[PDB]
Amino acid sequence: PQITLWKRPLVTIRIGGQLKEALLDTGADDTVIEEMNLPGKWKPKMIGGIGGFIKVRQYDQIPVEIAGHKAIGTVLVGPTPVNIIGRNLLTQIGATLNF
Amino acid sequence: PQITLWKRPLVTIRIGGQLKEALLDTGADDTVIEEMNLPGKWKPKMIGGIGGFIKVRQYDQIPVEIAGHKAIGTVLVGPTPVNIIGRNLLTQIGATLNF
Ligand SMILES: CC(C)CCN(C[C@@H](O)[C@@H]1Cc2ccc(cc2)OCCCC(=O)N[C@@H](C(C)C)C(=O)N1)S(=O)(=O)c1ccccc1
């Protein structure tokens, strides 16, 4: 599809068997999902943005379906105000910026 | 042009007559530039991100050239980790997300 940017680019994703609304974010290196009980092992880590850093749990090889497109990769879970789909997963669904 | 996301989408911009590097960020509502002197009046404002809120200087109707494309709009100046071109200017150059 072609998504314009008049509004935040929010789409439906499926992760851990749940459907969520997430932002397609070309400015995010990683994918950050709002707090949820994903099973599996994880490693702690800190990611930073405008305002400072937050602590998150890093989960590897998690399957995520983005608007019907299947992907699988690292997902960081923590207290983010919004679900963010980063470049690590966008590259997998062949997303590009065009102008 | 068509930009893929295996690397951060960094491009050269011209603002205040100066050249700088900025991230094309579909996840940013606004454009936030690192501290610098920009002619004209400005208003105090606060914006939030992953790690909380920061105080910025709001500059209105500033001409910014993004990879040869012209835009004129609001630019926020403050302590950001990187120069960010947000949706307010991306829509002016006709940027879209495609996949
Ligand atoms: C950009 C750089 C520093 C960091 C990469 N990050 C992606 C950006 O697009 C972030 C993502 C984001 C965060 C919070 C949100 C909405 C979106 O709710 C607030 C809405 C206001 C807004 O639009 N805030 C922008 C601001 C630049 C004007 C912002 O901070 N946007 S990030 O901090 O969230 C990260 C960092 C590391 C790993 C994943 C995500």
CB contact under 8 A, A26 and B5: yes
Lining ligand 1 with CB less than 6 A are A 25, 27-30, 32, 47, 49-50, 81-82, 84, 86; B 25, 27-30, 32, 47-50, 81-82, 84, 86
CB contact under 8 A, A99 and B1: yes
Radius of gyration from C-alpha coordinates of chain B: 13
CA angle (B85 as vertex; A49, A77 as ends), nearest 5: 30
The Cα–Cα gap between B99 and B87 comes to: 18
Cite the beta strand spans of B50-95 per DSSP E.
Answer: 52-66, 69-77, 84-85
C-beta of residue A15 within 8 angstroms of C-beta of residue A74? no
Instruction: Mark the breaks in chain B: residue after which each occurs, C to N over 2.5 Å.
Output: none
C-beta of residue B19 within 8 angstroms of C-beta of residue B67? no
Under DSSP, the state recorded for B33 is E
Give me the domains of chain A, ranges plus CATH numbers: 1-99 (2.40.70.10)
Counting Cβ atoms within 10 Å, is residue A79 exposed (0-12), middle (13-18) or buried (19+)? exposed
CB atoms within 10 A of CB A95: 23
Residues sharing a CB contact under 8 Å with residue B32, sequence separation 6 or more, in sequence order: A50, B47, B56, B75, B76, B77, B78, B80, B83, B84, B86
DSSP string, A54-94: EEEEEEEEEEEEETTEEEEEEEEEE--SS-EE-HHHHGGGT
C-beta of residue A27 within 8 angstroms of C-beta of residue B25? yes
The Cα–Cα gap between B43 and B41 comes to: 7
The coordinates were experimentally obtained by: X-ray
